Design a protein around this nucleic acid. Structure first.
Ligand SMILES: [Zn+2]
Ligand SMILES: [Zn+2]
Ligand SMILES: [Zn+2]
Ligand SMILES: [Zn+2]
Lengths: 80, 96, 72, 112, 99, 73, 98, 82, 113, 95
DNA sequence: ACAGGATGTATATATCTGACACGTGCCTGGAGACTAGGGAGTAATCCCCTTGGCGGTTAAAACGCGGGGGACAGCGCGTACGTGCGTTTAAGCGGTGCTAGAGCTGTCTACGACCAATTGAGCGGCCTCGGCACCGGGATTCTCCAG
DNA sequence: CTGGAGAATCCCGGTGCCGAGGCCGCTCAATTGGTCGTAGACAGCTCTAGCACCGCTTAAACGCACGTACGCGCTGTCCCCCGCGTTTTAACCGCCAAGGGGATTACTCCCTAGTCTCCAGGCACGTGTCAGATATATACATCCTGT
């Protein structure tokens, strides 16, 4: 698995901007948005993997993800 | 392989919904949102009351620590209505 | 006795277009649920104070159940 | 051998939310080595009041949406359309709730 | 004759209204699944993911990116622009505290 | 005498806008939910039965459930 | 012949001297009076430790300096070197204060 | 004794200095009133939390501990006061 | 028999300056868990001592270049803000009497024509 | 009688003299240091308590503290802190 | 500013279809009742230390003024992005199949709580001297006008 | 494009001062050494769901054409904020003084942990059935061209 940050396609970022009320999007927005999304995933996934490793588990449960989000001040409802 | 056991606020949220909206249902995803909300607010109030008891060197959490935690955590007029409801429940519980 | 009946008309007439709870100013709001008429700032205060029920029939109303009305 | 049958503390305080479960969770959650008798009653009352507030707002949104079943979108609208309830859950995201519909005034057409 | 063509922006406004009225995920599920798996394999090889964990991660990322684009749009409007440019995202992230 | 004249003038002005502009004879008791204007229920049933879904004030389209009686007194 | 510095240079000198220094930039008695006024608006007949008022002054000065840093960045974003109330509002709303 | 309009005691040169520490070169004339407003809002929040902490402790004196807990509550942890 | 060792602090057993005993007591009275393991205060004291050593090394380095042989809160603030990793650890933390990090935006500098 | 209060002042000073033999510290800086130590202790202990609650463990062990350190401390600081904690626990186990 | 043509959107009926609401059987987690012991509420005291006033003075704020440099409106352009269309990709849905690891259970043992004796670390108070604050003076460096 | 004049800043040295650090005394909490209970590690088993592959369909991504509107640079103009000098003012320090209440102690009582038994509230499961997408069919609200 390599080079799938471009799997977060240009229209997907456009749709996310549309939900965010963005009328016009520059062409350089997409790469930098992919970068910041990568950073966000790195932080959240690293915390979730730490939570999984503590539990002596090899499966990242949804509870690990919600704990990781809650620790970063990004509490998420609907997954326990 | 026996059956496990899990605890939730689902029936309590449903009772409150039926007493506030008699003819309105709730989906399973919305019930999960509600259960997570109740758990989050419960842990938030309990942690604030625990810190309040620790600051005052008190070994017990009484209705006053929950009073103060509600006055702190809940914003604006939500705070005063929650204080009114909590004091009402405490008075009616001590009466009976 | 014409003036006394004239004054009796004043108290009855000015009572039905003023908000029954505030009772100093003209009604400019209407609830969709109970289909009663009040004034706009009183119903805003009741919504903001989380007492989201009609002042007299205690019918629960949403944010969109009340809006500006123009009686005149 | 004569004793009272049963009377839940939630029923004593006139609460739907469980006073007993809240008391047990307060003891087991390592908050203090002692927990008062009225503390779970108060906490259950506060949790029930908050639940009633959010559920009433969500049901109002659902009724305005011509839906008699509450979905997470209705809960999100209830939170985001109530400023106190919004800032109580400001750092909280709701799954499948969407966003509050708004468009900045400069983005609207110029009507020229 | 004269095939219909909406002016630039009104289609964008219609998408804004549609995607603010709706609640579904705006990113395709399989590419995000694969991206999460790549970012996770850098922390612990031979890792498994609950499906609900990936849905939770997707919901979190959609919410974060939507809020970031809200702040980005506000930054762009602040600079008297209607288009969003990378410096808008940089300023929004740095004020929010990431940078 | 001046006070009575002023009172009669304000009574007439208050009766002027207390009456349905579509009829201008008798009092309003209803509103149109899609144009936020106050009319009288008998005028609105008259417009409904004769198949004109145009508002007397702003010509906005409305239907059967788009209007309802309201409680003034 | 009087001597004047061109606008901005003295401002830069103040920036340097107040970034090298660490003392409180607000007069102590006016801030203490403001704190006491807000407190009596919240609870009447209230007393303050001196350390409490100093802690409030440090917290408020730090918050205002951070807010002005973000406001300055907002100003630079709009191709401006002066800060405006819309800059403060944008910074506050992005920080989540509005 | 009661106190009034002491928000004006946070004077214009004080806000000038605070922005200088924030690396601000030019300041608009309308900055000062908005700064007073936002400082007043921040102080209302912090002082309300500190007064609530003091009222819980049955105390009629606001200590530095109450301020420290009120700040750590709001994600504004303060060092050097306990 | 009464033949017993005189004393041996757990800090000295773990080779730590920070108190293992006091950290253990604070863990017990903090209502963190029903039980606290033997190695938990050792690990926590070691981590706290490492963080203290790191920040104190940086603060002493900041104090040395100011010709000061005594760390002041300004030196601690400079140490934390210069070290972006400690800065991100203490991002939401403000220091009394520490001042701010001296920096000016490059566009605010004079054009110098 | 007399009020008694505990602090990390002597410990911080011993660490300082270990890392900087000919450097002093002020009272305000010592207060900063004590506040920092209590803050980090509270963060790590609370995170370890949360880990124990999530994993249904009734005890806080070195595993909980290590996981809390990995979660809270950033990057290379977390790496060095984990190494130091493991070193101290292994040294304590031998003695 | 106003037709109208088209595009899109908002209402009004059949129709399946899982999800939701309700009914049953457990069963274990709350409720009743009672004990006991410690936490805390209350009364008293005392001594920090907070508040309030007065006076000097002097640093800082407030005021007013000159001007210059930045804010902002307007213009022009050119290119980057939006919209639409034809093409291609891979997402999504379902279905099967395999098994790895989540999850639970029974042993038991080895850690953690508890407790009695104690003693050495750590805190409060004292005191001293030196790091640093402060003053002053010269040298250096930055800014700015005017050649 | 610098010279030089003016002003801000750095550096050097001398002097006092107050607090940083070392020391002493005391005391109480951390240490040592046991017992005892039970939390969890540890092996074993089950079976849930995570993963992998396959194929078809079609929604969506993608590449391109073309136009347009807006991002950005430039110009003017103009007016608002900065620098600075003067006057006022109230911040700040010192000193005094009162008494408020924070902090501590002592006593008692009542409130909560802990136990045991018991039963019913809630959870897991099962099942009917009904809002509810999901279509069409019809009636308005914008969008854009055009005049
Ligand atoms: Zn009214
Ligand atoms: Zn009514
Ligand atoms: Zn009529
Ligand atoms: Zn109308």
């Amino acid at each position: 698995l390599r080079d799938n940050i471009q799997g977060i396609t240009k229209p997907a970022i456009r749709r996310l901007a549309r939900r965010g009320g963005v009328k016009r999007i520059s062409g350089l927005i997409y790469e930098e948005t992919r970068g910041v999304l990568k950073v966000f995933l790195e932080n959240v996934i690293r915390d979730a993997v730490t939570y999984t490793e503590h539990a002596k588990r090899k499966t990242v449960t949804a509870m690990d993800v919600v704990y990781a989000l809650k620790r970063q001040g990004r509490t998420l409802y609907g997954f326990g | 392989r026996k059956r496990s056991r899990k605890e939730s606020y689902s029936i309590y949220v449903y009772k409150v919904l039926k007493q506030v909206h008699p003819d309105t249902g709730i989906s399973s995803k919305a019930m999960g949102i509600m259960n997570s909300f109740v758990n989050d607010i419960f842990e938030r109030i309990a942690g604030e009351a625990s810190r309040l008891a620790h600051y005052n060197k008190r070994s017990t959490i009484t209705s006053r620590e929950i009073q103060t935690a509600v006055r702190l955590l809940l914003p604006g007029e939500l705070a005063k209505h929650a204080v009114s409801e909590g004091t009402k429940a405490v008075t009616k519980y001590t009466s009976a | 006795k014409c003036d006394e009946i004239l004054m009796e008309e004043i108290k009855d007439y000015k009572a039905r277009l003023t908000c029954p709870c505030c009772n100093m100013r003209k009604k400019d709001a209407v609830l969709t649920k109970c289909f009663h008429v009040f004034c706009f700032e009183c119903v805003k205060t009741r919504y903001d104070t989380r007492q989201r029920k009609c002042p007299k029939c205690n019918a629960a109303f949403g944010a969109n159940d009340f809006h500006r009305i123009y009686i005149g | 051998k004569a004793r009272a049958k049963a009377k839940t503390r939630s029923s004593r305080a006139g609460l739907q939310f469980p006073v007993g479960r809240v008391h047990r969770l307060l003891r087991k959650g390592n908050y203090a080595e002692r927990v008062g008798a009225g503390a779970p009653v108060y906490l259950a009352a506060v949790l029930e009041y908050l639940t009633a507030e959010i559920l009433e707002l969500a049901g109002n949104a659902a009724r305005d949406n011509k839906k008699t079943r509450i979905i997470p979108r209705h809960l999100q609208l209830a939170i985001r359309n109530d400023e106190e309830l919004n800032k109580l859950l400001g750092k909280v995201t709701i799954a499948q709730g969407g966003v509050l519909p708004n468009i900045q005034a400069v983005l609207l057409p110029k009507k020229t | 004759k004269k095939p219909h063509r909406y002016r630039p922006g009104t289609v964008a406004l219609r998408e804004i209204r549609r995607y603010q009225k709706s609640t579904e995920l705006l990113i395709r599920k399989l590419p995000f699944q694969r991206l999460v798996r790549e970012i996770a394999q850098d922390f612990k090889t031979d890792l498994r993911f609950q499906s609900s964990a990936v849905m939770a991660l997707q919901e979190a990322c959609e919410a974060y990116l939507v809020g970031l684009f809200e702040d980005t749009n506000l930054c762009a409007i602040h600079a008297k622009r209607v288009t969003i440019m990378p410096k808008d995202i940089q300023l929004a992230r740095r004020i929010r505290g990431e940078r």
